[PDB]
């Protein structure tokens, strides 16, 4: 009865703050799209743009915006088929290694905070050469280095 | 993705604060703490007699002895950035008693 | 030879906490099971209500 066409294990999404857009049939997918805002005030947009266009029409992320406000990002190579452009703030981007095998590329981001609130949700608008993709994303702090922080009373 | 498909209850429109919702932990059947929040199915569950409340359908019961939705608490951030109760419960929380309207 | 009601690992009571297996004693399980199998029929009469546990 649980192994039917409607199944609990099949409908699940990842346990991450980032929203996602695109079906398996869509040309370009954005996974894990989130607005990061560290406690020190710096902010940016984490996401991963994956190209799966079966026409092999390699794209280039022209721009990204949060509520129409610009986010800085540079040195974004074109994304040919079966390639991932991972984007995150520079401090968090430094924590993981760029893979020499595979098509992945790492790119840094930053945006001036207009006053976004932790907890809320804000639209995010991507525009690539082949079109625009819109998706609402939440605002949250980056993840702590696990195990280092204690509850401090004052 | 799950906050998109929330159904708001008539009169409880602005109680949430973004992603945050705040329901009463006391079951509306007999008052055990509900406390079993299924993170994917989004069903708040009561272990005492297996009531299931849909966290997306304003906490309305979906299974078990419970007949009534969990009351909701309005919340908002304060001047300093902590979370505060922005109001009182509009509905008597806990188990029902004889003179409780609805 | 057999442990019964090992209270030392349940902790003291406070109304905000509960366990998955929290049934009453065995001789009370019948009156628990009744409350589990009642199909939630509740009456509302203006200013009054008969709960589903009546």
């Amino acid at each position: 009865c649980s192994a039917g066409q409607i199944t609990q294990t099949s409908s699940q999404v990842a346990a991450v703050d980032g929203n996602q857009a695109g079906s398996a049939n869509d040309p370009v997918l954005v996974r894990d799209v989130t607005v990061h805002l560290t406690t020190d005030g710096e902010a940016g947009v984490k996401f991963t743009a994956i190209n799966q266009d079966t026409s092999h029409t390699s794209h280039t992320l022209e721009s990204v915006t949060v509520d129409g406000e610009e986010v800085e990002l540079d040195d974004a190579e074109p994304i040919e088929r079966n390639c991932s452009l991972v984007a995150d703030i520079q401090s968090e981007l430094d924590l993981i290694e760029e893979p020499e095998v595979g098509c992945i590329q790492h790119v840094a981001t930053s945006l001036e905070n207009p006053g976004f609130a932790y907890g809320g949700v804000v639209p995010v608008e991507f525009v690539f050469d082949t079109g625009a993709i819109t998706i609402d994303a939440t605002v949250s702090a980056p993840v702590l280095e696990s195990g280092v922080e204690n509850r401090e009373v004052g | 993705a799950d906050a998109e498909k929330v159904i708001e209850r008539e009169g409880q429109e602005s109680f949430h604060y973004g992603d945050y919702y705040a329901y009463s932990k006391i079951c509306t059947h007999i008052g055990c703490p509900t406390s079993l929040y299924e993170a994917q199915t989004n069903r708040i569950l009561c272990p005492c007699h297996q009531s299931q409340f849909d966290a997306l359908h304003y906490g309305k019961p979906v299974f078990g002895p419970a007949a009534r939705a969990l009351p909701q608490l309005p919340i908002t951030v304060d001047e300093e950035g902590y979370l505060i109760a922005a109001g009182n419960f509009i509905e008597p929380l806990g188990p029902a008693f004889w003179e409780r309207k609805s | 030879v057999t442990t019964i009601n090992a209270i030392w690992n349940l902790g003291p009571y406070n109304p905000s906490q509960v366990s998955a297996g929290s049934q009453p004693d065995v001789y009370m399980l019948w009156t628990d099971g009744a409350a589990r199998v009642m199909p939630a029929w509740e009456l509302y009469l203006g200013n009054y209500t008969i709960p589903a546990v009546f």
């Binding site: 949700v121 639209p123 | 159904i7 708001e8 008539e10 429109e13 950035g81 609805s102 | 509302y44």
Partner: peptide, 25 residues
Amino acid sequence: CSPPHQQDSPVQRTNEILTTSQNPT
């Protein structure tokens, strides 16, 4: 056999954006 006041809203919850006041800097 359902509560009279337990009615789903007509409002369709278009997003209400949130902000916090910024320091003068």
